[PDB]
Amino acid sequence: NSNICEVCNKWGRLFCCDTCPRSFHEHCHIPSVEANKNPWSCIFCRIKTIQERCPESQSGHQESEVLMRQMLPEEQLKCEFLLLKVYCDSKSCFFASEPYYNREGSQGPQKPMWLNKVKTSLNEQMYTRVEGFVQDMRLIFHNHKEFYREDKFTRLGIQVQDIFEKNFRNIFAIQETS
Ligand SMILES: [Zn+2]
Ligand SMILES: [Zn+2]
Numbered sequence: 707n708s709n710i711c712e713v714c715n716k717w718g719r720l721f722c723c724d725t726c727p728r729s730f731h732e733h734c735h736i737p738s739v740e741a742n743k744n745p746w747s748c749i750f751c752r753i754k755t756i757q758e759r760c761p762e763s764q765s766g767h768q769e770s771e772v773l774m775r776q777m778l779p780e781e782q783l784k785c786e787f788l789l790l791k792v793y794c795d796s797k798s799c800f801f802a803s804e805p806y807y808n809r810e811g812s813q814g815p816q817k818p819m820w821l822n823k824v825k826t827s828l829n830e831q832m833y834t835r836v837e838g839f840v841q842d843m844r845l846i847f848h849n850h851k852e853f854y855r856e857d858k859f860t861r862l863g864i865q866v867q868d869i870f871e872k873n874f875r876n877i878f879a880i881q882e883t884s
């Protein structure tokens with residue numbers, strides 16, 4: 707097993723996957739690392755099993771059909787994994803916790819959003835369709851772009867949105883286009 711958390715890249719109290727060499731802090735894994743379960747398989751392993759059980763799940767899909775999918779267990783897991791892939795980027799720190807807005811010339815968003823809020827909402831099964839989760843994720847970056855206006859800090863929202871969008875296309879096997 708690796709000696710650092712796969713998500714935050716730090717050592718500490720780590721739980722080790724049984725089917726691959728990754729390790730995790732308890733609350734870095736999503737969902738949080740389960741109490742018992744021997745053997746235990748990480749989210750990476752669980753996602754790979756879905757693909758192996760249904761190889762055709764990798765054929766291209768339209769985004770509009772993906773978004774309308776109900777949050778059955780396999781789509782729940784895919785969204786958890788996509789959320790985890792965002793936390794994997796260190797720049798996710800800017801979007802993790804509850805923001806506040808007091809900048810000359812800007813007004814805060816009408817609907818603030820942040821990663822830990824999305825994490826709670828997934829844990830509490832508050833999204834009934836993939837679209838709910840994707841809308842809240844895209845709202846994080848849109849709020850940031852609007853608030854920061856011409857400040858160069860706007861670029862952090864572009865960067866982390868690009869990580870989200872690339873992983874969304876991968877995990878949900880969105881049809882490749884020019
Ligand atoms: Zn960690
Ligand atoms: Zn694993």
Ligand SMILES: [Zn+2]
Nearest residue numbers: 759760761762
């Ligand atoms: Zn199949």
